């Protein structure tokens, strides 16, 4: 007899093992090419590596599980929002105990559903939340004649131009707290039109969470809404003593990418919108004056060689030249004599169209491109330290 692997086998001809879709080997105990994390619960045996489309090589993260807790945020950081995020308020939100929130002022809001909008520690890059859960407790009361609402999402996840919803199996009953456990697994989420979420789309949304909304209204005319015991799974590189985040892919990324799913541009690289998944990462364009830049916007950082601008494309105040040429000596200091105009502190000058500098903050009474002479009805010689005073005055 051959003992087929319970995790990766669909069944057995007694001497042959029949494998799940993403499983290989005699005993159906190995992940296929581009797959990882064999588990009995996965009908395919193993997850497909996604890696934001830039790699097929990955295995289970060694990062440890941890939780973002509601109680670790100030009450002021929570708010209510409509689904579209066009109508939001904190007015009326209070905390009757640590990480517990309460709202009972629906009369001030429009006739539409509202959601608790989780604050920033629950958003941003949460690819590591994949395979974990969002846990929370809700309690709600409607007004006396409130029409129930049908098929409203319990949770809405918005990120990277993707919207996904989770619907509960049961609505919370009036006046009594319901515990929910929402898995970050594609089977538990749908698009707004009720089409199933894909792994790819869930991961893309998780990688750049813009909003994570929990239903606060429930009925057409709510009286009271409460939220507590909020816990969101993540993973961290530090050892926590919890289980490792095996459902989280750790990709081998190509040059230019980092993060477990290759979801971030690496040092020296920045996002190009090139339109598959999140886009690509290409080298910073800093005209040779920096090798570092904002990963998502491209804005160069710590421009060298007395340059500045989003692509280090300009010489700083007090210098001149063509910073786009790309050399360390693009920008030379301004050869301007005397004190600046408008009692200002630095001289400015620019590279004129003849290839030579022209000073454009000379003092009154100063003439010439270097502020080097004095103007008619003025006297002095700035090239020899002397300033310009008007004829007739002292000395």
Swiss-Prot record:
Residues annotated as transmembrane: none
Domain Laminin IV type A: start-end pairs: 66-250
Record-annotated disulphide pairs: 4-17, 19-28, 31-46, 284-293, 286-300, 303-312, 315-331, 334-349, 336-359, 362-371, 374-388
Domain of life: Eukaryota
Laminin EGF-like domain segment(s): 4-48, 49-58, 251-283, 284-333, 334-390
Modifications the protein undergoes after translation, according to the UniProt entry: Proteolytic processing produces the C-terminal angiogenic peptide, endorepellin. This peptide can be further processed to produce the LG3 peptide.
Subcellular localization: Secreted, Extracellular space, Extracellular matrix, Basement membrane; Secreted
Knockout-associated phenotype: About 40% of perlecan null mice die at 10.5 dpc, the rest die just after birth. Embryonic percelan-null mice exhibit cardiac abnormalities including mechanical instability in the early stages of development (10.5 dpc) with lower amounts of critical basement membrane components, collagen IV and lamanins. Basement membranes are absent in cardiomyocytes whereas adherens junctions formed and matured around 9.5 dpc. Mice also have skeletal dysplasia characterized by micromelia with broad and bowed long bones, narrow thorax and craniofacial abnormalities.
Biological function: Integral component of basement membranes. Component of the glomerular basement membrane (GBM), responsible for the fixed negative electrostatic membrane charge, and which provides a barrier which is both size- and charge-selective. It serves as an attachment substrate for cells. Plays essential roles in vascularization. Critical for normal heart development and for regulating the vascular response to injury. Also required for avascular cartilage development.
Record note on quaternary structure: Has a strong tendency to aggregate in dimers or stellate structures. Interacts with other basement membrane components such as laminin, prolargin and collagen type IV. Interacts with COL13A1. Interacts with FGFBP1. Interacts with VWA1. Interacts (via C-terminus) with ECM1 (via C-terminus). Interacts with SVEP1.
Protein name: Basement membrane-specific heparan sulfate proteoglycan core protein
């Amino acid at each position: 007899i051959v003992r087929c692997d319970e995790r990766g086998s669909l069944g057995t001809s007694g001497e042959t093992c029949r494998c799940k879709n993403n499983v290989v080997g005699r005993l159906c105990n190995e992940c296929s090419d581009g797959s990882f994390h064999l588990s009995k619960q996965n009908p395919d045996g193993c997850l497909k590596c996604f890696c934001m489309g830039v790699s097929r090589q990955c295995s289970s993260s060694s990062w440890s599980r941890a939780q973002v807790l509601g109680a670790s945020e100030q009450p002021s950081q929570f708010s209510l929002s409509n689904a579209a995020g066009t109508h939001t308020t904190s007015e009326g939100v209070s905390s009757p105990a640590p990480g517990e929130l309460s709202f009972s002022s629906f009369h001030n809001l429009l006739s539409e559903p509202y959601f608790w909008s989780l604050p920033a520690s629950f958003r941003g890059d949460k690819v590591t939340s994949y395979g974990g859960e969002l846990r929370f407790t809700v309690m709600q009361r409607p007004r006396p004649s409130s029409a129930p609402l049908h098929r409203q999402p319990l949770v809405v996840l918005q990120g990277n131009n993707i919207v996904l919803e989770h619907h509960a199996s049961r609505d919370p009953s009036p006046g009594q707290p319901s515990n929910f456990i929402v898995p970050f697994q594609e089977q538990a989420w749908q698009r707004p039109d009720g089409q199933p979420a894909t792994r790819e789309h869930l991961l893309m949304a998780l990688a750049g969470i813009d909003a994570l909304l929990i239903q606060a209204s429930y009925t057409q005319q709510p009286a009271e809404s409460r939220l507590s015991g909020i816990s969101m799974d993540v993973a961290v590189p530090e050892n926590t003593g919890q289980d490792s985040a095996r459902e989280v892919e750790q990709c081998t990324c190509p040059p230019g990418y980092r993060g477990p799913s290759c979801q971030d541009c690496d040092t020296g690289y920045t996002r190009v919108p090139s339109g598959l998944y999140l886009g690509t990462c290409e080298r910073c364009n800093c005209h040779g004056h920096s090798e570092t830049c904002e990963p998502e916007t491209g804005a160069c950082q710590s421009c060298q060689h007395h340059t500045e601008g989003a692509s280090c494309e300009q010489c700083q105040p007090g210098y001149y030249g063509d910073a786009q040429r790309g050399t360390p000596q693009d920008c030379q200091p301004c050869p301007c004599y005397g004190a600046p105009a408008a009692g200002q502190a630095a001289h400015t000058c620019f590279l004129d169209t003849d290839g030579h500098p022209t000073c454009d903050s000379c003092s009154p009474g100063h003439s010439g491109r270097h502020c080097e002479r004095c103007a008619p009805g003025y006297y002095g010689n700035p090239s020899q330290g002397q300033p310009c005073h008007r004829d007739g005055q002292v000395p």
